[PDB]
Amino acid sequence: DDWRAARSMHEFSAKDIDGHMVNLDKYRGFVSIVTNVASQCGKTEVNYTQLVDLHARYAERGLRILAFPSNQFGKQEPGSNEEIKEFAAGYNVKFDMFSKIEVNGDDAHPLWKWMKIQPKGKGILGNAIKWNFTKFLIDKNGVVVKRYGPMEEPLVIEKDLPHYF
């Protein structure tokens, strides 16, 4: 039995940006955005500021955001987890930061392997994560309900959120 059999994001575990294991069942009952981040992309500022906006405006309704740094796209996240943590803190991030991972290939974190094969997580244009700042919207049961590509600014997700609260 492996990740292909998982039924929910809530089954998974991941190290937070401080190295501590997190059981993602903490997100049971919470609409969640899962995104891969990087600090040195042209759209880093727009993505972080809009994710912060979304969290500020919707956390009280149950929105949670899980940010996974990854260095797989143009080496745009070269820093240590501590450096990334400090970078995010500079944007007043109050959502959840995770330790750096891979999102594609055989060493990808299993949550990312799983999200990519879900009916609403498969890409319109293929499943692989194409660049930094792909976003998955996850319902309160941990089911993937929509995928938004790197070119879709986080505020576009706002249109869909109330459907899942």
């Binding site: 039995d1 492996d2 990740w3 059999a5 039924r7 190290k15 299993p110 799983w114």
Partner: peptide, 13 residues
């Protein structure tokens, strides 16, 4: 059911 960091899954017995 839980999936560990390495991708293995275990459920209630």
């Amino acid at each position: 059911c839980r999936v560990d960091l390495q991708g293995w899954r275990r459920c209630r017995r």
